[PDB]
Amino acid sequence: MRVVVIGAGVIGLSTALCIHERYHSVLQPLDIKVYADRFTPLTTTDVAAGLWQPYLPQEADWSQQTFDYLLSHVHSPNAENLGLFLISGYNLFHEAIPDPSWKDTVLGFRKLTPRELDMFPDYGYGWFHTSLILEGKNYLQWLTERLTERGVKFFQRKVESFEEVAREGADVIVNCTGVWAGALQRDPLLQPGRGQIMKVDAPWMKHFILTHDPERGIYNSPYIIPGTQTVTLGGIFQLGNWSELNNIQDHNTIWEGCCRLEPTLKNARIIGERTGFRPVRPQIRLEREQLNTEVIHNYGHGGYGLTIHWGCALEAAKLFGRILEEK
Amino acid sequence: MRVVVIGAGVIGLSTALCIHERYHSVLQPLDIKVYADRFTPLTTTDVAAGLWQPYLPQEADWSQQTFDYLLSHVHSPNAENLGLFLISGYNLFHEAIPDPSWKDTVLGFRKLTPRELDMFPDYGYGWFHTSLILEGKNYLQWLTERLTERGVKFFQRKVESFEEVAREGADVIVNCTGVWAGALQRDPLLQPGRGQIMKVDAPWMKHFILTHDPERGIYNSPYIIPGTQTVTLGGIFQLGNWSELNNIQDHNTIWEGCCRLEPTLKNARIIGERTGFRPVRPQIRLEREQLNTEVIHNYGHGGYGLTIHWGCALEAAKLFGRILEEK
Ligand SMILES: Cc1cc2nc3c(=O)[nH]c(=O)nc-3n(C[C@H](O)[C@H](O)[C@H](O)COP(=O)(O)OP(=O)(O)OC[C@H]3O[C@@H](n4cnc5c(N)ncnc54)[C@H](O)[C@@H]3O)c2cc1C
Ligand SMILES: Cc1cc2nc3c(=O)[nH]c(=O)nc-3n(C[C@H](O)[C@H](O)[C@H](O)COP(=O)(O)OP(=O)(O)OC[C@H]3O[C@@H](n4cnc5c(N)ncnc54)[C@H](O)[C@@H]3O)c2cc1C
Numbered sequence: 001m002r003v004v005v006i007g008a009g010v011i012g013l014s015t016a017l018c019i020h021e022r023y024h025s026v027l028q029p030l031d032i033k034v035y036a037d038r039f040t041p042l043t044t045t046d047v048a049a050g051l052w053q054p055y056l057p058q059e060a061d062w063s064q065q066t067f068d069y070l071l072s073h074v075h076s077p078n079a080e081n082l083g084l085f086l087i088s089g090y091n092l093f094h095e096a097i098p099d100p101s102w103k104d105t106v107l108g109f110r111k112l113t114p115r116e117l118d119m120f121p122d123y124g125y126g127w128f129h130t131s132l133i134l135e136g137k138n139y140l141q142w143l144t145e146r147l148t149e150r151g152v153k154f155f156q157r158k159v160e161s162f163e164e165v166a167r168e169g170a171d172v173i174v175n176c177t178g179v180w181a182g183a184l185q186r187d188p189l190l191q192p193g194r195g196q197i198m199k200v201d202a203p204w205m206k207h208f209i210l211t212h213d214p215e216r217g218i219y220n221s222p223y224i225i226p227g228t229q230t231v232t233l234g235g236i237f238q239l240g241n242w243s244e245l246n247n248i249q250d251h252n253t254i255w256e257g258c259c260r261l262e263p264t265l266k267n268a269r270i271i272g273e274r275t276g277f278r279p280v281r282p283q284i285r286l287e288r289e290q291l292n293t294e295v296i297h298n299y300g301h302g303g304y305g306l307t308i309h310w311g312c313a314l315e316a317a318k319l320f321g322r323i324l325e326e327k
Numbered sequence: 328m329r330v331v332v333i334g335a336g337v338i339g340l341s342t343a344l345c346i347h348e349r350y351h352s353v354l355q356p357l358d359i360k361v362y363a364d365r366f367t368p369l370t371t372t373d374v375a376a377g378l379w380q381p382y383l384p385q386e387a388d389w390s391q392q393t394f395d396y397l398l399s400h401v402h403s404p405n406a407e408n409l410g411l412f413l414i415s416g417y418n419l420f421h422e423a424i425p426d427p428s429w430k431d432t433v434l435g436f437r438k439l440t441p442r443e444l445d446m447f448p449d450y451g452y453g454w455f456h457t458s459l460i461l462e463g464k465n466y467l468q469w470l471t472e473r474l475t476e477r478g479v480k481f482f483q484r485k486v487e488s489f490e491e492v493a494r495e496g497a498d499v500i501v502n503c504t505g506v507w508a509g510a511l512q513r514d515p516l517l518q519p520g521r522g523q524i525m526k527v528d529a530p531w532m533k534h535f536i537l538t539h540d541p542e543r544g545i546y547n548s549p550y551i552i553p554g555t556q557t558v559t560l561g562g563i564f565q566l567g568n569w570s571e572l573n574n575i576q577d578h579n580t581i582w583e584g585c586c587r588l589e590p591t592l593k594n595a596r597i598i599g600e601r602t603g604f605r606p607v608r609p610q611i612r613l614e615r616e617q618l619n620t621e622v623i624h625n626y627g628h629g630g631y632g633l634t635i636h637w638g639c640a641l642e643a644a645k646l647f648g649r650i651l652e653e654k
């Protein structure tokens with residue numbers, strides 16, 4: 001049993017990891033190799049601030065599975081090398097809207113008192129809550145090391161095709177190709193959703209602030225997310241846009257929006273800045289297909305890959321076990 | 328006159344700025360575009376620690392042009408913006424060797440003394456001199472800034488060939504594709520010299536230390552070049568290895584190597600870790616070739632492209648002014 005996971009963001013490495021935790025004891029030899037053309041810190045996953053938060057329905061179970069999972073680890077000392085921690089903060093809107101499904105997964109969820117709404121002249125409604133953050137860059141790095149302990153080998157290649165990989169002699173292929181899955185098997189329902197962010201030095205920001213606006217659309221209005229080192233600013237989401245390139249208006253839009261939202265930001269040193277492509281699909285593709293060869297796809301996580309990736313991996317891992325059960 | 332520059336490393340952006348800096352006041356209009364599929368922080372450039380030093384005809388001159396031009400700007404306000412500063416430290420050898428030809432270009436060149444030579448107890452000899460560091464990341468940003476205020480537009484684009492660009496409307500194509508040059512036109516002299524590095528936190532390190540040993544060969548023994556915010560630990564050179572993926576054996580090699588050079592780094596926290604491809608050629612190809620259309624080649628700067636970039640950039644400008652005349 002010779003497995004090739006293609007892809008090395010959060011999705012591809014969790015999966016590999018899950019599959020190894022659960023299966024290596026049960027065969028005989030389990031050989032897993034990962035193929036990506038990009039490793040940290042050059043993946044979409046390296047540009048996510050990594051806040052846990054879904055969109056405003058197995059996907060709910062999955063996110064939640066990942067929340068209970070990370071949380072059960074936040075007060076361990078692996079947590080640091082994971083870049084895992086807890087953070088509170090605001091969601092802000094113009095109009096009233098219903099509580100989300102994750103109401104009760106996050107900690108201490110509630111509506112904002114008028115006095116807390118007094119500080120954001122521009123918003124009429126909000127939530128406060130405690131969530132948690134997984135920095136992509138460290139996460140990816142921790143995953144890397146845990147894989148490398150479990151003797152899992154990496155290779156840098158662009159895979160042109162699944163046949164490429166079956167002919168080398170994979171029995172099982174796991175496609176974790178994020179936004180790039182179309183290149184391998186066509187997907188009219190996968191589109192990139194271009195994001196941009198800046199990293200600024202603002203170590204007094206201890207809260208996340210996310211704003212929402214119906215005309216702007218999802219992930220397209222100011223947000224501010226404190227990290228371990230820098231505070232992440234962003235609020236760019238443009239469907240169908242494949243330019244891996246920082247752009248000047250986006251920079252401004254981010255800067256003006258973020259400073260307006262939080263004037264104190266005006267003196268924060270810009271540290272760096274980056275673009276990525278959220279794998280937008282109306283729904284994560286997470287499912288088996290036969291080629292003689294077996295394929296588990298697991299892409300189309302859009303703007304919530306960190307939030308969900310571990311229910312996905314545990315789910316990809318039952319698919320892997322359902323296969324062997326047919327052998 | 329339609330001008331297209333391929334590459335956003337120090338070479339392309341350099342030559343670009345420098346071409347525009349010289350001929351914007353004569354044509355009428357000079358329309359300049361940059362096409363690259365990779366920009367900061369994913370070029371080979373953002374990988375260099377950026378320390379000025381050639382090996383041990385024309386390139387000699389180009390290096391000293393680059394070094395003088397950086398010295399003329401070392402005490403200016405934009406040095407910080409540029410990521411440029413003075414640094415001294417050591418070159419350590421097993422045997423005596425001839426003085427290098429840039430002896431008089433760097434400042435205060437000298438032979439190490441007995442007391443100094445007692446500090447590296449594996450090395451019978453070397454030099455101390457004062458040099459400068461031009462930090463790879465900061466520099467490209469600075470350059471993108473100059474080019475952008477200047478109206479040079481950038482596009483994210485893997486160019487599949489010269490004609491495709493030719494057929495758009497380009498009069499001059501400037502070829503700055505580093506190690507990939509050979510994909511646009513076969514060049515069997517040009518090869519990868521993979522290096523890996525780590526960036527550590529050791530801000531008590533105020534000197535560079537280059538070691539050398541022909542029995543490992545070029546860039547293939549330990550080195551410690553301090554930067555603005557961290558210190559680069561290196562010593563890896565692999566001819567023909569095309570794996571962009573940090574390697575654990577190479578990690579150990581650099582780690583063990585430097586902590587032996589400089590025992591003090593065993594307590595240094597590891598910040599990050601990068602692989603790049605040095606465009607290794609027996610010389611820089613910087614020459615004209617007509618394909619119809621005009622092509623200036625500027626690529627193959629091995630492991631001293633920041634050391635030499637302004638010179639080559641000056642020479643590529645020149646070649647450009649000559650193309651005008653003919654037209
Ligand atoms: C600006 C921005 C902010 C974000 N913030 C958050 C956040 O706060 N919280 C959260 O939960 N999510 C966030 N996300 C969403 C999240 O970052 C992504 O949904 C998720 O990382 C995608 O993971 P992936 O592993 O599927 O893709 P990637 O990390 O992009 O990895 C896909 C891998 O597949 C490889 N690959 C593709 N094609 C091939 C090929 N043919 N051959 C070999 N390898 C191939 C690629 O090299 C890469 O290694 C954000 C996204 C963006 C853009
Ligand atoms: C570990 C390491 C340390 C180094 N340290 C130093 C140092 O201290 N001092 C020093 O002087 N030098 C150092 N160097 C050498 C230096 O990094 C290189 O000489 C220099 O970066 C080369 O710059 P570039 O413009 O040639 O190529 P690159 O940085 O690689 O830029 C090439 C560009 O062209 C693009 N491209 C290529 N083909 C196409 C195409 N078909 N279509 C569109 N775009 C294309 C790429 O995406 C990229 O943007 C170091 C190198 C390494 C690997």
Ligand SMILES: O=C(O)c1cc2occc2[nH]1
Pocket residue numbers: 050051052053054195219223234235236278303304307
């Ligand atoms: O811009 C984004 O993709 C984004 C920001 C953010 O905060 C929590 C989840 C999330 N996604």
Ligand SMILES: O=C(O)c1cc2occc2[nH]1
Pocket residue numbers: 378379380381522537546550552561562605629630631634
């Ligand atoms: O590793 C390299 O390629 C490299 C190291 C170094 O120190 C001065 C120039 C230079 N290049």
